Amino acid sequence: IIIATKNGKVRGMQLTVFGGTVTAFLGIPYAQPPLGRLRFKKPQSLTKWSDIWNATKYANSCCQNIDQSFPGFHGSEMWNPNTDLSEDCLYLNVWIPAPKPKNATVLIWIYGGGFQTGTSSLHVYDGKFLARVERVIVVSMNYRVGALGFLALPGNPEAPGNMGLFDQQLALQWVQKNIAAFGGNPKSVTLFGESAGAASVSLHLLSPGSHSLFTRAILQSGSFNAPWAVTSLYEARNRTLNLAKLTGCSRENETEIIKCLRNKDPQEILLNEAFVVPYGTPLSVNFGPTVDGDFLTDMPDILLELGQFKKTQILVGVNKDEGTAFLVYGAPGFSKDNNSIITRKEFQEGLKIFFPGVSEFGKESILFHYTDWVDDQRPENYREALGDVVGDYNFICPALEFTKKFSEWGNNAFFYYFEHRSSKLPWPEWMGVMHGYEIEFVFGLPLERRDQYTKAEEILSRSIVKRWANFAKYGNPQETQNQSTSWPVFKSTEQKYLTLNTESTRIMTKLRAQQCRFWTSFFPKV
Ligand SMILES: *[C@@H]1O[C@H](CO[C@@H]2O[C@@H](C)[C@@H](O)[C@@H](O)[C@@H]2O)[C@@H](O[C@@H]2O[C@H](CO)[C@@H](O)[C@H](O)[C@H]2NC(C)=O)[C@H](O)[C@H]1NC(C)=O
Ligand SMILES: *[C@@H]1O[C@H](CO[C@@H]2O[C@@H](C)[C@@H](O)[C@@H](O)[C@@H]2O)[C@@H](O[C@@H]2O[C@H](CO)[C@@H](O)[C@H](O)[C@H]2NC(C)=O)[C@H](O)[C@H]1NC(C)=O
Ligand SMILES: CN(C(=O)Oc1ccc2ccccc2c1)[C@@H]1C2CCN(CC2)[C@H]1Cc1cccnc1
Ligand SMILES: *[C@@H]1O[C@H](CO[C@@H]2O[C@@H](C)[C@@H](O)[C@@H](O)[C@@H]2O)[C@@H](O)[C@H](O)[C@H]1NC(C)=O
Ligand SMILES: *[C@@H]1O[C@H](CO)[C@@H](O)[C@H](O)[C@H]1NC(C)=O
Ligand SMILES: *[C@@H]1O[C@H](CO)[C@@H](O)[C@H](O)[C@H]1NC(C)=O
Ligand SMILES: *[C@@H]1O[C@H](CO)[C@@H](O)[C@H](O)[C@H]1NC(C)=O
Ligand code: NA
């Protein structure tokens, strides 16, 4: 099958899924390759072609540093890129149901990776189950990460910042101009993303240039008000200069700095990225979104507080154990290979690692709030406290504050709390329901019975896929047929959320109320 797009014809491939057929277009380009004089610049328009483009295999993933903290360990390496790294990586993928739909709702996926890593060709990001089972069209794109995507000299168009976000935005533009030719409705487009991807989705809610490119939005374990998500103009400039010094590109004319960095090999930029910050944590975002004056016209906390964003429905949620994954990447006493029982002194050492530029009193307040033991004789007490500190501060409390702030302006919002630790995961049990552990359930991998998942997990993923699809089509994430718990809207007063698990789906209220009042009200002062 061939499809005629605004820039030329493209050829796809057929996929047998669950006794049916999905058509896949892997690797359509959506911008001029950002090479040479184009490195660090906004993505440039793609000039037509007269031939048939073969969209039949995933394209190159963008340049990035690979995670090698556990070589040969599937739990980390399944997130490493699975196609060639290259600066020529501005490509996207399309999964359309067969037979060609007539006006299908589109789901657009934005992967995370701390704004430094990630790629849309990962196995857990395969859109074919969602297209087969729910008849939505799934789209995903590669966008530039790290310094190649977010190096910032604010004002200077040679390196204005936010290039990865403008990559995402240009791919959404492609969906507006082209997806009807695939049988999709450009007027029913839902963005969804996880971690830095979720943060990216929330920034598309703020950026006026994105407001007409999508309908609704789904935020999984991530939002732009998280402490890691937005870099100040101060830090962005300092870090760009630290990178120029690290590569001998230090000049006085700032444009001549950008020209000097353009002649460095992609690798040489990648190797020095890590050292532009003085103190780093497992959650560092060396090069990330900034207030560029273009994509972000003001500091996003101000735009949230004052209601400056797209008015629409949102679906937001978090996992029970967001913080645990990061503890084995540097906290003393922790290991994926033992139950990581830490002492009080090890907990305090852990805080120094995750809170380097915090005052001494700051660290003492975290200690005080989180070690008032109900039972001090539990040896996992400190182990669990440090995970909860990292998870509440970095993910859960910013997600709730974003949802409260957002709903206060009249829009329907739905909040979930994902608490299933799946059956086949390679990380140990003490890490619980880890960051990223819901992606496979959202994409419907447990719907594959040969994939070593339990039956309860197939049921959970089936219900989640239905709710996500109903949210994208209708703005309302119910499973209306199989006698399911209704999912109430999240209001600022009552703060009802839905829990997702294989046992009992429950309505609860005011998630982490005492912990988030600490982080969101007391702590930012320090
Ligand atoms: C495809 O459907 C759209 C309408 O989509 C629905 O309405 C949206 C506002 C949004 O809520 C979606 O989730 C819905 O599924 C049709 O749009 C109409 O287009 C005509 C042009 O002929 C226009 O005059 C109408 O005002 C539009 N209706 C709207 C905006 O509701 C569109 O034509 C459909 N196209 C095909 C080929 O089926
Ligand atoms: C759990 O292991 C940590 C990490 O130690 C490493 O991984 C282990 C699985 C094993 O292969 C060790 O030999 C490795 O060093 C242990 O913390 C270490 O403790 C030693 C003293 O025994 C100390 O010298 C190291 O600096 C520690 N390493 C770190 C990263 O803190 C920890 O003691 C183990 N915990 C439990 C409860 O068994
Ligand atoms: C891939 N991997 C990773 O990239 O996680 C980071 C790394 C740095 C971050 C900095 C700030 C904010 C969030 C960050 C997240 C994480 C890492 C820990 C837990 N499993 C396994 C390894 C992954 C979860 C995941 C999967 C896809 C996208 N995201 C996260
Ligand atoms: C693009 O692909 C064309 C056809 O691909 C081949 O034929 C189809 C029917 C499938 O079986 C497919 O897997 C085969 O590889 C080629 O003829 C054409 O040269 C390709 N264009 C390139 C490589 O630039
Ligand atoms: C950048 O930050 C580093 C670390 O804080 C510091 O040493 C340096 O003075 C800052 N400024 C410049 C211009 O390098
Ligand atoms: C910096 O370089 C640019 C690009 O060549 C040039 O237009 C500008 O005059 C230079 N400015 C200074 C102060 O050297
Ligand atoms: C509803 O229940 C039936 C069995 O009674 C099951 O096969 C089906 O997939 C379920 N659907 C959803 C959307 O959960
Ligand atoms: Na209550």
Swiss-Prot record:
CDD domains: Esterase_lipase. It is found in: Secreted. The modification Phosphoserine is found at S195. InterPro entries: AB_hydrolase_fold, AChE-related_enzymes, AChE_tetra, CarbesteraseB, Carboxylesterase_B_AS, Carboxylesterase_B_CS, Cholinesterase. Changing E87D: In BCHED; the mutant undergoes rapid degradation. It is an enzyme of class 3 (hydrolase). Keywords: Disease variant, Disulfide bond, Glycoprotein, Hydrolase, Phosphoprotein, Secreted, Serine esterase, Sialic acid, Signal. One of its GO terms (molecular function) is amyloid-beta binding. Substrate binds at G113, G114. Tacrine binds at W79, H435. One of its GO terms (biological process) is xenobiotic metabolic process. GO terms for cellular component: blood microparticle; endoplasmic reticulum lumen; extracellular region; extracellular space; nuclear envelope lumen; plasma membrane. Belongs to the type-B carboxylesterase/lipase family. Esterase with broad substrate specificity. Contributes to the inactivation of the neurotransmitter acetylcholine. Can degrade neurotoxic organophosphate esters. This is Cholinesterase.
